[PDB]
Design a protein around this nucleic acid. Sequence first.
DNA 1: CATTACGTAATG
DNA 2: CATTACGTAATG
Lengths: 68, 66
Amino acid sequence: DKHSDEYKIRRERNNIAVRKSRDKAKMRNLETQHKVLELTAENERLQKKVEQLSRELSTLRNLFKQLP
Amino acid sequence: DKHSDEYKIRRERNNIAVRKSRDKAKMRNLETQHKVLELTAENERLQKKVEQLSRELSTLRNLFKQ
DNA sequence: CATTACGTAATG
DNA sequence: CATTACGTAATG
């Protein structure tokens, strides 16, 4: 059964499919890791934008009250 | 090599460690995908603030050219 | 073919 | 002990 040629071919093909499936799983993990870095960078960009608008706004609010 | 008590025990212990190591890997992967969902949720939060501030600013500039 | 539990062995 | 390449077998 294990010395039959059909078992040997069967194992050859599955071994190839296993390697391929494990390597695609790696890549999906790397992509998810890449996503964390993209969200983090865009997150940093967005809070700095919020901080700019917050400043521009708060600056104005304080000078408006600055004149009865 | 095998059939020895030495080898049977060594395998029992490695098998336990493998299972542990694979379960811990599952969880770090789980954690990483938890992180994308929080960065995504926090992203949407920050976008909506930028938009609210942008609106508040923009209405101001427009009303000033009267 | 693709996926995954389970195991072996080499290795840090 | 923990990690990982490599393989087997059951299964979708």
